[PDB]
Structure formats: C-alpha cells, structure tokens
C-alpha cells in the first residue's frame, strides 16, 4: 500500500491499485434528503454498548483507531436494517483542514467538519477477514460532527492524541465509553456500500445518523495536529483524510424516519 490523501496518491488515484474503487456500490455518497424514502419497515437501531471494552488507540497513518475487544459479543449493533449481530471492532474519524469540509457522506451536498465511523462485523462470518468478503459482512454507523459546543465524551480521545502524533504510535486506551459520542436521536439513513479506504470492499451496510454531534473548535484543532508521517519524518499534518462522494448508481437510500 502507498495510497493516501496527499497531492499524488489521493482518492482519485486509488483505482489503479484497487479497481473496485470504480465499482457499483462505493462509499461515501451524497444523501439527497428529498430523494431518500421513508421505509416504515425499518426497525429502531439497537446500539448496545453497555459492555464495550476499549483497549488501545493507534495512529495508522491515515486516521486514528480506537480499538475494542471483539473476541466475544460485548458491544454490538443490531436492528435497524440489519439481520443478526454485528460486533464493534474500532471507531475512527475523518476530518478537514478547516470546518467547511471533513465528512465523507454529505447531506444535500453539505459537508460537515468531520465524521465518526463506528465499525462492526457480522458475527455469522466468525472473523473480520471472512466478513469483508460478504455483501452483508459489515455495518458502519456514521455520525456527523459540526463545530460548536464541546462534546464532553470526546475529550478523553482528544487528550491522548499528543501521545500518538505519528504513524505507528499507539497508547493504552482502556475504559472509554463510546456511548458518550452518540447524539440524542438514532434516526438514520441506510444504503449498501463499501469501505471508504483501501481495500474499498463492497461489504458494508451503511447507517448514517441524521443528527450531528457538536464538538468544539479546540477539540477538532487537536485532531488537525496529528501527522500522517512517521516519527522524525517531514511533518505532514493529518488533515483532509476523507474520500469524496462516489456515484450512487443503482442504489436506494432509505430513511428510518418520516
Ligand atoms: N472508513 S470505513 O469505511 O469505516 C473503513 N474502511 C476500512 C478499511 C480497512 C479496514 C477497516 C476499515 S473501516
Ligand atoms: Zn471511516
């Protein structure tokens, strides 16, 4: 892998190493709120994070992942458009160099300052590597961030970032409660899509919450002090690590709410 979000290895180049980048169910997409159809057959989402066990936070050179113990059913996502049980494996964000961009999904072409991805895999496939080979292998819960009032539940994440500034650095990150990152409402849009970084596999049921969370300018400024580069290498600020909207093609975006 040599892909990134720089001036010569960005999303417009990915198709050369990952031809599925030009596929029929790529993510993210623009959510046209007037075209998305209310589906009364969709169920309430069930976000069961009471027993979540966070373990570690890693700068992987494209974002930072907060990793969970997914060795058994602790934190799981069920219901909504989903059949079966999906285990939380990690969350990460995508963000911008300034507040007017950062999100991957857009809403009537509006870009949010950032987007949180809570990533889950379908336990019926036994492990992540098997799950990503299946069209219903993953469920990613996407939550928009706008800049305003501080999000108290995000501050523990913010405060550890200085310790994982560069690619390949990690730190212990136990006892973090991801419920503190959820908005009030679980109203959502859903559509079939893909991973938004290589390998871009078309194995995701996307669930994107309508209600954004508010974070402070100071919180997102700390995201923007991270580095894409490794220790001692020329500093490249980790900013604009988002893939733009991809063609919707023959896909329907459904709303859980009227
Ligand atoms: N950005 S995302 O679709 O949530 C995502 N992409 C990837 C790629 C490789 C491994 C895990 C994930 S999770
Ligand atoms: Zn993501």
Swiss-Prot record:
Additional facts recorded: Target of drugs used in treatments against glaucoma disorder and breast cancer.
CDD domains named in the record: alpha_CA_I_II_III_XIII
Gene that this polypeptide is encoded by: CA2
Impact when changing residue 60 to T: Reduced activity
Subunit structure: Interacts with SLC4A4. Interaction with SLC4A7 regulates SLC4A7 transporter activity. Interacts with SLC26A6 isoform 4 (via C-terminus cytoplasmic domain).
SUPFAM superfamilies: Carbonic anhydrase
Modulation of this protein's activity: Activated by X-ray, histamine, L-adrenaline, L- and D-phenylalanine, L- and D-histidine, L-His-OMe and beta-Ala-His (carnosine).
Protein name: Carbonic anhydrase 2
pH dependency: Optimum pH is 6-8.
Species name: Homo sapiens (Human)
Mutagenesis or variant effect for residue 199 to A: Normal CO(2) hydrase activity, but impaired stability
Effect on the protein upon substituting residue 63 to S: 2-fold decrease in enzyme efficiency, as determined by kcat/KM ratio, and efficiently inhibited by chlorzolamide
Active site per UniProt: 62
Annotated consequence of substituting residue 60 to H: Reduced proton transfer
Variant or mutagenesis effect after changing residue 140 to H: Impaired activity
PROSITE patterns: ALPHA_CA_1 (PS00162), ALPHA_CA_2 (PS51144)
Binding site for Zn(2+): 92, 94, 117
Residues recorded as bearing Phosphoserine in the entry: 163, 170
């Amino acid at each position: 892998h040599h892909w990134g979000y720089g001036k010569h290895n960005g999303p417009e180049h990915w198709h050369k190493d990952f031809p599925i980048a030009k596929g029929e169910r790529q993510s993210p997409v623009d959510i046209d709120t007037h075209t998305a159809k209310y589906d009364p057959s969709l169920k309430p989402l069930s976000v069961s994070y009471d027993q979540a066990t966070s373990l570690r936070i890693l700068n992987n050179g494209h974002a930072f992942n907060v990793e969970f113990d997914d060795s058994q059913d602790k934190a799981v996502l069920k219901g909504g458009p989903l059949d079966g049980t999906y285990r939380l494996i990690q969350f990460h964000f995508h963000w911008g160099s300034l507040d007017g961009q950062g999100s991957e999904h857009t809403v009537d072409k509006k870009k949010y300052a950032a987007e949180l991805h809570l990533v889950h895999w379908n336990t019926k496939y036994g492990d992540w590597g098997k799950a990503v080979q299946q069209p219903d292998g993953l469920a990613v819960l996407g939550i928009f961030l706008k800049v305003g009032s501080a999000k108290p539940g995000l501050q523990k994440v913010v405060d550890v970032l200085d310790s994982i500034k560069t690619k390949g650095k990690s730190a212990d990150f136990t006892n973090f409660d991801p419920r503190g990152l959820l908005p009030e409402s679980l109203d959502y849009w859903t559509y079939p899509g893909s991973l938004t970084t290589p390998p871009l596999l078309e194995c995701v049921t996307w669930i994107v919450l309508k209600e954004p969370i508010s974070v402070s300018s100071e919180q997102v400024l700390k995201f923007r002090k991270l580095n894409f580069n490794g220790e001692g290498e020329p500093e490249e600020l980790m900013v604009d690590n988002w893939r733009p909207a991809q063609p919707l093609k023959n896909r329907q975006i459904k709303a859980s709410f009227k």
